[PDB]
Design an enzyme around this catalytic site. Sequence first.
Site, PDB file in Angstrom:
ATOM      1  N   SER A  43       3.670  -3.727   0.016  1.00 30.78           N
ATOM      2  CA  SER A  43       3.303  -5.124  -0.167  1.00 30.78           C
ATOM      3  C   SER A  43       4.056  -6.113   0.733  1.00 30.78           C
ATOM      4  CB  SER A  43       3.404  -5.484  -1.656  1.00 30.78           C
ATOM      5  OG  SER A  43       3.551  -4.295  -2.431  1.00 30.78           O
ATOM      6  N   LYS A  46       1.390  -8.060   2.769  1.00 28.61           N
ATOM      7  CA  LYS A  46       0.709  -9.229   2.223  1.00 28.61           C
ATOM      8  C   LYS A  46       0.984 -10.498   3.022  1.00 28.61           C
ATOM      9  CE  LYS A  46       0.549  -7.311  -2.402  1.00 28.61           C
ATOM     10  NZ  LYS A  46       1.221  -7.254  -3.725  1.00 28.61           N
ATOM     11  N   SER A 103       3.812 -10.847  -5.748  1.00 31.88           N
ATOM     12  CA  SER A 103       3.347  -9.552  -5.252  1.00 31.88           C
ATOM     13  C   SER A 103       2.178  -9.033  -6.087  1.00 31.88           C
ATOM     14  CB  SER A 103       4.493  -8.541  -5.204  1.00 31.88           C
ATOM     15  OG  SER A 103       4.275  -7.590  -4.177  1.00 31.88           O
ATOM     16  N   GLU A 139      -5.468  -2.430  -1.910  1.00 31.98           N
ATOM     17  CA  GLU A 139      -4.617  -2.136  -3.055  1.00 31.98           C
ATOM     18  C   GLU A 139      -5.365  -1.219  -4.022  1.00 31.98           C
ATOM     19  OE1 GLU A 139      -1.541  -2.804  -3.386  1.00 31.98           O
ATOM     20  OE2 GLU A 139      -1.179  -4.370  -1.896  1.00 31.98           O
ATOM     21  N   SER A 210       7.302  -2.153  -2.108  1.00 32.74           N
ATOM     22  CA  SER A 210       7.763  -0.889  -2.670  1.00 32.74           C
ATOM     23  C   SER A 210       6.571   0.029  -2.889  1.00 32.74           C
ATOM     24  CB  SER A 210       8.528  -1.099  -3.982  1.00 32.74           C
ATOM     25  OG  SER A 210       7.680  -1.613  -4.992  1.00 32.74           O
TER      26      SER A 210
HETATM   27  C1  LIG Z   1       4.708  -4.059  -3.175  1.00 28.98           C
HETATM   28  O1  LIG Z   1       5.213  -3.164  -2.579  1.00 28.98           O
HETATM   29  N1  LIG Z   1       4.271  -3.774  -4.516  1.00 28.98           N
HETATM   30  C2  LIG Z   1       3.635  -4.777  -5.440  1.00 28.98           C
HETATM   31  C3  LIG Z   1       4.404  -4.899  -6.752  1.00 28.98           C
HETATM   32  N2  LIG Z   1       5.750  -5.566  -6.517  1.00 28.98           N
HETATM   33  O2  LIG Z   1       6.520  -4.840  -5.549  1.00 28.98           O
HETATM   34  S1  LIG Z   1       7.396  -5.923  -4.606  1.00 28.98           S
HETATM   35  O3  LIG Z   1       7.912  -7.180  -5.546  1.00 28.98           O
HETATM   36  O4  LIG Z   1       8.697  -5.137  -3.951  1.00 28.98           O
HETATM   37  O5  LIG Z   1       6.447  -6.515  -3.389  1.00 28.98           O
HETATM   38  C4  LIG Z   1       4.568  -3.585  -7.436  1.00 28.98           C
HETATM   39  C5  LIG Z   1       5.023  -2.470  -6.558  1.00 28.98           C
HETATM   40  C6  LIG Z   1       4.369  -2.418  -5.180  1.00 28.98           C
HETATM   41  C7  LIG Z   1       2.999  -1.764  -5.348  1.00 28.98           C
HETATM   42  N3  LIG Z   1       2.889  -0.557  -6.137  1.00 28.98           N
HETATM   43  O6  LIG Z   1       2.017  -2.224  -4.841  1.00 28.98           O
END
Ligand SMILES: *C(=O)N1C[C@H](NOS(=O)(=O)O)CC[C@H]1C(N)=O
EC number: 3.5.2.6
Length: 260
Positions: A43, A46, A103, A139, A210
């Site tokens: 993410s 984004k 996110s 996603e 993440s």
């Molecule tokens: C981004 O990697 N994601 C979106 C969400 N929050 O993660 S972040 O705050 O480090 O950007 C959940 C985990 C992850 C995902 N599984 O998409």
Amino acid sequence: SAVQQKLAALEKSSGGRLGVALIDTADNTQVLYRGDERFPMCSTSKVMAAAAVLKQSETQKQLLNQPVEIKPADLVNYNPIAEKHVNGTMTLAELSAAALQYSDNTAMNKLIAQLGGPGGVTAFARAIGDETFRLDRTEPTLNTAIPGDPRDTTTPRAMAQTLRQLTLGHALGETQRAQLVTWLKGNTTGAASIRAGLPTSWTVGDKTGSGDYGTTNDIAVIWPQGRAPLVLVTYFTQPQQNAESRRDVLASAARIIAEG
Ligand SMILES: *C(=O)N1C[C@H](NOS(=O)(=O)O)CC[C@H]1C(N)=O
């Protein structure tokens, strides 16, 4: 160099793979660690999608006010803000803020649709000189973060340069460049990553990411005090698919980079 030696030791203690790119916008110098290796973006991608919609808004001057329906079939694995507006609508500005500041993955998927699929996000990166960024999926499958998989990856060097052009440079329009800066400054997900390793006096805007294989990412524009801003990208991924997040690695890498 000496900072290169500290990041390498940090990588060794972590048991993972670490990629760091710092740009000092005073002498345009760069500190890189595995800066040309590919890392799963998760993410952090984004930012590119939100910036691409911002670029659209330069010609469609009321695009960000357009309402977009949030339907139950639109919800995916993480929908903090979009869950609160199912069977309602959200503007493209609200979806961009939700994507960058909480996110929200349903918001990301709405931005991707506005740009015509993931190929529209990749297109924008190419338009601003980013030859490395590539977005192949939506996603949530873009977060599989499989070793060796080039899908939805970029290098630290390319994201640092791109993040600079989007915020400090003028890859975007004036109002858009300021909007993205304000969005990044108000992120809520990054207190344990790059921010945790920097002085309290430093003002920072960031976007975290993440995924699987313990992938833990953060990209950030940094404003110190009386100093020329810096841009730092910190990417981290691990050998086990089930590995847990290591936001502390990101904090320590920012600590090392920021002289320490
Ligand atoms: C981004 O990697 N994601 C979106 C969400 N929050 O993660 S972040 O705050 O480090 O950007 C959940 C985990 C992850 C995902 N599984 O998409």
